[PDB]
């Protein structure tokens, strides 16, 4: 769970050394050839992103996004 | 700044926040402190019959 | 009490640095330069005699 | 249920048959009738592009909203 | 409510068929040359849609701001 | 009042007839170079208009945002 | 306060008048070189207008979001408390 | 430390003297090569600031997204009772 630095994300992946890329909201999840992992944020919305992943021949992986909760409403409003 | 009474030349007012109570009293706020800049262009005849910029 | 005030006035060392600008040679040649200049305020009394703004 | 971008790469290659698109998912109707579910990671302005140069089906529906009736109810069920 | 997709609306469009739509939200309904009405859904926002229908020529209308009332709805909510 | 199309009045901004054009959200009020009036609405976001609005000298305004006074609106969310 | 045209704004910034622009939100608080001021109003978004301000050596500014506080937002909350 | 507009950023980052730099919606803190420290508003979306930073190799990181705790949310919604 090591926070690193979005840059040197780029300097990885522009290097071709990470395969495995976890997509939800605006966190990565990151898993690079040596089964280590981090995570990191990206800072603002780019549209080079995944042409820059798609290029390097990298993969991905993404998940639905999160369904809401009830139950502090339930918990809230109901007592 | 300047304030004025019933449209008269009055006391020039001192910078900052001044505090008076007057009404009948009116204040025309702006005489800025700065250096001002203003340009010119065009295209001139000479005196050998010439046209520069 | 409200008829008095004050202004600041700094005696710090200052600068000034220009843009580029034309001049032309001896020989009939064009160059452009360059500068920064060094300045201080030396005595404290005719500065606002003279600037009379106190505005540097 | 599958990789975006496998999916990327089976559409270059002309197998899909349809583009049943609703929301932020895409079901995949190919030519051999395999279904799965992919998912869309981030905004891509391509995908649109990427699709429509390859003459497949591409078909969007109206959503379902949340029935007002039941709006009412969670609004005085308490 | 006979739908016609957005793709093979698009195409019928290439082929030059509509003479005009009124446009609302996401949906597009559309009156094309040959008298027929009917109606699509647009899959994510699309850049080159308008200037698409431009190109063609074709009519296209907006549709006047849809809004719900806020008047009713405080007190009907307070009823 | 008087309700025109976004598309027509693209072409006859494109004819050069328009002098002042006033922009709320989506409305378009409108008061062309012959003292006449109409009205039209912005279909949806548009990437290309404010270029063919400004490079003829269609003359433009922008009014500011209705914000609700505060007051107001908790005095009628007591009751 | 006198409110002026999009359109004069920027045919008069093209024109090398302008030295300050505080913007907030769509609010623009234009100062001439000519030390007078006034306000603008962008029609909407203009992908072309940051540029278009810093390409001349106009000096631009930004202004931070005003958040509601929490003690006078529960105060009002909590006012029919 | 002094607010600074944002087109003297811009010529600063220009001339590569910005080291680190961290990104919140709109709202920006820099750390300079010479220790000193600012913080800095964005005006108006801009798509090609990122690349402008990135090909002048500065650090640029992020941070977490604030989520407020719902059990905070039932507390002061509970606050009547």
Do not use: C
């Not at chain 1, 800072?43 to 139950?71: A, R």
């Not at chain 2, 900052?16 to 010119?40: H, M, Q, S």
């Amino acid at each position: 769970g090591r926070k690193v630095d979005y840059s040197t994300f780029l300097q990885e992946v522009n290097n071709d050394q990470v395969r495995e890329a976890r997509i939800n909201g605006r966190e990565i999840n990151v898993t690079k050839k040596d089964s280590n992992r981090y995570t990191t944020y990206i800072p603002v919305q780019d549209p080079k992103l995944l042409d820059n992943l798609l290029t390097k021949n990298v993969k991905v992986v993404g998940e639905p996004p999160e369904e809401p909760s009830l139950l502090a409403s339930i918990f809230i409003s109901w007592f | 700044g300047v304030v004025t009474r019933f449209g008269k030349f009055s006391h020039l007012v001192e910078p900052g926040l001044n505090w008076k109570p007057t009404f009948i009293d009116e204040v025309k706020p702006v005489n800025v402190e700065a250096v001002r800049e203003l340009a010119a262009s065009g295209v001139m005849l000479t005196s050998d019959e010439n046209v520069v910029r | 009490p409200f008829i008095e005030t004050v202004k600041m006035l700094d005696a710090r060392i200052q600068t000034m640095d220009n843009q580029a600008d034309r001049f032309v040679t001896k020989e009939k040649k064009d160059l452009i330069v360059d500068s920064y200049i060094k300045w201080r305020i030396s005595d404290f009394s005719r500065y606002y005699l003279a600037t009379g703004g106190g505005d540097i």
